[PDB]
Structure formats: C-alpha cells, structure tokens
Amino acid sequence: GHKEVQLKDQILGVLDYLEKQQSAWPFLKPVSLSEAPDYYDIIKEPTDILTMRRKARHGDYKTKEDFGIELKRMFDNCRLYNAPTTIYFKYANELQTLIWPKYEAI
Ligand SMILES: Cc1nnc2c3ccccc3c(N[C@@H](C)[C@H](c3ccccc3)N(C)C)nn12
Ligand SMILES: [Cl-]
C-alpha cells in the first residue's frame, strides 16, 4: 500500500517532467486511424503519456519496471512505425534521452 503510493508519486513526477518537454507534445494523445490508417496493423501494444498517467494514478504499476517497459514501448513503437526523417522519430529519441535519467532515479 505505502510502497505503491511512493512509486505512484515517483512515476507521476517522471511523467510531469516528460510532458513539459517541447518534444513531448505528439505523445500526449493516442494515434488515430484517420492520420495513420495502418498504425494499428504495425503497433500491437500502443501507448501514450495520458494513458500511462491514468494507469499510474489508478495504481496499475506494481513496480518501477512495469512502468519502464511501457515508457520504453512508447518510444520503440514510435520508431518502429515512423521513418527516421519524421519529427516523431526524432522527438522520440530526444525525449527518451531527456527522461531516462529521471526514470532511472525512481
Ligand atoms: C506520437 C506519434 N507517433 N507516430 C505518430 C503519427 C504518425 C503519422 C501521423 C500522425 C502521427 C501523430 N499525430 C499527432 C500529431 C496527433 C496529435 C494531435 C493533437 C495533439 C497531439 C497529437 N495524434 C496522436 C492524435 N502522432 N504520432
Ligand atoms: Cl478522465
């Protein structure tokens, strides 16, 4: 109970730092089929910042690694789908590089 509360707050603190970065804005909501019709043929376990924040608020992450797996998957999904010239691919790398020390300190 108390260990989950401490972890929840730390995860939200990392998601707070993540969302105030300029490269975070495209990750604030899920991709739609209108803008990327074959996105969900390629990405089987989609995620985004708001989804992870809801999950964190509700107590869904029992451990730091449970959060880490999905955080990393947000970036990995993005680079799997998008070509290297896209802003999405480029921001996923900038944003992941920025957040990783914060995630590691959890
Ligand atoms: C993130 C991400 N990774 N791949 C994609 C993608 C691929 C092809 C076309 C569009 C996207 C994409 N669209 C973003 C701009 C778009 C958006 C709109 C408003 C606020 C936040 C985000 N989507 C996620 C709804 N966001 N996105
Ligand atoms: Cl809500």
Numbering used by the authors: 1355 to 1460
Question: What does the publication say?
Answer:
The p300/CBP‐associated factor, PCAF (KAT2B), is a multi‐domain protein containing a single Brd, an N‐terminal domain, and a histone acetyltransferase (HAT) domain. Known to associate with CBP6 and p3006b during transcription, misregulation of PCAF has been linked to cancer, HIV infection,7a, 8 and neuroinflammation.7a, 9 Despite predictions of high druggability and links with inflammatory disease,7a, 11 the role of PCAF and, more specifically, contributions of the Brd in such disease states are poorly understood.
The dimethylamino group forms a salt bridge with E1389. ‐45 (average distance 4.5 Å); a π–π stacking interaction between Y1442 (conserved in PCAF as Y809) and pyridazo ring of the triazolophthalazine motif (average distance 3.7 Å); and characteristic H‐bonds from the triazolophthalazine group and N1436 residue (conserved in PCAF as N803) and a water molecule. ‐45 lies in a hydrophobic groove between W1379 and the alkyl linker of K1383. Interestingly, K1383 in PfGCN5 is substituted with E750 in human PCAF, and as such the Plasmodium homologue features a slightly open KAc‐binding site. Targeting this difference may allow for design of Plasmodium‐selective Brd inhibitors. ‐45 was confirmed to be (1S,2S). ‐45 competitively displaced a biotinylated tool derivative, compound 46 in a homogeneous time‐resolved resonance fluorescence (HTRF) assay (PCAF Ki 47 nm), corresponding to exquisite selectivity over BRD4 (>4500‐fold selective).
